[PDB]
Design a protein around this nucleic acid. Structure first.
Length: 108
DNA sequence: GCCATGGCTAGTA
DNA sequence: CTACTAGCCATGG
């Protein structure tokens, strides 16, 4: 399965997720049948054009945190796009962001 | 061939 | 609960 294919398959999927609900890199990685590949899922979400009509924000790590991203300081962007979804978000004095996973976790 | 680098994850302290 | 190691694997220099 050549890249671009995979790239599509993933996208088709993140359009599948419902408002408010969410998934992780781990999970989409296996959903499309390519489990060893979340790494390449962050990868796919990075490759997105910002004014995309895709729930790029509804995908976090398995720890149920927001990931770093660096070259988009406004990784923060991902948060508020989600409070615009009814999801309560906090942190630690580690000052990350976290959430009640098995609640909002997208169970298909 | 080499390395290093990511929006990762799971295991094990 | 954090904290660190190992694997993981595309992309680019």
């Amino acid at each position: 399965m050549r890249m671009d294919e995979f790239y599509t398959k993933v996208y088709d999927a993140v359009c599948e997720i419902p408002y408010g609900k969410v998934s992780t890199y781990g999970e989409i990685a296996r959903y499309v049948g390519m489990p060893s590949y979340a790494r390449q899922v962050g990868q796919a979400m990075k490759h997105l054009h910002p004014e995309t009509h895709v729930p790029w924000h509804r995908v976090i790590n398995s720890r149920g945190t927001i990931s770093k991203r660096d070259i988009s300081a406004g990784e923060q962007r991902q948060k508020d796009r989600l409070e615009e979804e009814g999801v309560e978000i906090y942190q630690t004095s580690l000052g990350e962001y976290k959430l009640n996973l098995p609640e909002y976790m997208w169970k298909p």
